[PDB]
C-alpha cells in the first residue's frame, strides 16, 4: 500500500515548493525591484521644473510606485516566515526515518499537515499583500500614461511652457557675456553661441533633445511598470491554483497512513523531495535577510 503514501507525501512537498518558488524564483527575479527602489529615490529630482499638472502626477506616480515596493515586501516578509518553519519542519521530517517506527511515522504527519496548514494561511495573507501591490502598479500605470499626454502637451514647441523657457534661456544669454556657458532646464547646458541664436535655431533643438529625454525616461518607467504589473498578476492568479491544491493535498494527507514497509527507494526519493524545498527555503530566506 506504500507506493500512495508516498505519491501523497511527494506531491504534497512538491506541490507546497512550486508555491514557494513562485516568490524564490518568479517574483523575485522578473520584477525589477532594485530599479524601482532607485527609480524611486530619483522622483523628486527636478520637481520644480514640471508643470502643475506634471508635478501632481509624477508625485503620485512616485507613491503608488512605493506602496507597490511596500507591499511586495509584506508579501515577503510573509512567506518568508513559511519558509523558515518549513526548513525545520522538513529536517526533523528526514530525521524521522531513522530508527523508524509508528510513533515517528504520526510524527511525520503531523509536520506535513502543519507545514501544508502554515502555508495555506501564510500565502492567503500573502495574496492580500500581492494583490494591493498590483492594484498600485495598475494606478501608476494609467498615471504614467496620464504624464505621458501631459509632456507632450508641455514639451511641445508651441506651448506656454516651452516658450517660457526658450526666452529665459535668451534673457540670461543676452543679460551675460559672449562666449559663456547658459543652464536650462532639467539639468542642460548650453554654450552662449547656442543660446544667443549667432547660429538662428539651433537653441531650440538642444532644448527639444532635453525635453524629449525626459519624456522618454517616463514611457521607459511606463513600460517597465506595466510589465511588472502583468507579471505580478501571472504570480498571484497561479499562487491561487496552488493554493487550492495545498488544500486538497491537506485533506488528503490528512487521511493518509504514513506508517508502512517503505523500500530503499522511495525512503531516498522521500527524503530527496523534503531536501528540495529546504534549499528552496533556505535560498530565499538568505536573499531576504537571514543571516548565519
Not at 510513533?103 to 502554515?118: C, E, P, T
Not at 498578476?233 to 494527507?253: F, S
Not at 528552496?280 to 531576504?288: G, S, V
Amino acid at each position: 500500500v506504500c507506493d500512495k503514501t508516498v505519491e501523497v507525501v511527494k506531491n504534497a512537498i512538491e506541490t507546497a515548493d512550486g508555491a514557494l518558488d513562485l516568490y524564490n524564483k518568479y517574483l523575485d527575479q522578473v520584477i525589477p525591484w532594485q530599479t524601482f527602489d532607485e527609480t524611486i529615490k530619483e522622483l523628486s529630482r527636478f520637481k520644480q521644473e514640471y508643470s502643475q499638472a506634471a508635478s501632481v502626477l509624477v508625485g503620485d506616480i512616485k507613491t503608488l510606485l512605493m506602496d507597490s515596493q511596500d507591499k511586495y515586501f509584506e508579501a515577503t516578509q510573509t512567506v518568508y516566515e513559511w519558509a523558515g518553519v518549513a526548513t525545520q519542519l522538513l529536517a526533523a521530517y528526514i530525521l524521522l526515518f531513522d530508527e523508524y517506527n509508528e510513533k515517528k511515522a504520526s510524527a511525520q504527519k503531523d509536520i506535513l499537515i502543519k507545514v501544508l496548514d502554515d502555508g495555506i494561511t501564510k500565502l492567503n495573507e500573502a495574496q492580500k499583500s500581492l494583490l494591493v501591490s498590483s492594484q498600485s502598479f495598475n494606478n501608476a500605470s494609467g498615471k504614467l500614461l496620464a504624464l505621458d499626454s501631459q509632456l507632450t502637451n508641455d514639451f511641445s514647441e508651441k506651448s506656454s511652457y516651452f516658450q517660457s523657457q526658450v526666452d529665459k534661456i535668451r534673457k540670461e544669454a543676452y543679460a551675460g557675456a559672449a562666449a559663456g556657458v547658459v543652464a536650462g532646464p532639467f539639468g542642460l547646458i548650453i554654450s552662449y553661441s547656442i543660446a544667443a541664436g549667432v547660429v538662428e535655431g539651433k537653441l531650440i533643438p538642444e532644448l527639444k533633445n532635453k525635453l524629449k529625454s525626459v519624456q522618454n525616461f517616463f514611457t521607459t518607467l511606463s513600460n517597465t511598470v506595466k510589465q511588472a504589473n502583468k507579471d505580478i498578476d501571472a504570480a498571484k492568479l497561479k499562487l491561487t491554483t496552488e493554493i487550492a491544491a495545498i488544500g486538497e493535498i491537506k485533506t488528503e494527507t490528512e487521511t493518509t497512513r504514513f506508517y508502512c514497509d517503505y523500500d530503499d527507494l522511495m525512503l531516498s526519493l522521500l527524503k530527496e523531495a523534503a531536501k528540495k524545498m529546504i534549499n528552496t527555503a533556505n535560498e530565499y530566506q538568505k536573499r531576504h535577510g537571514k543571516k548565519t
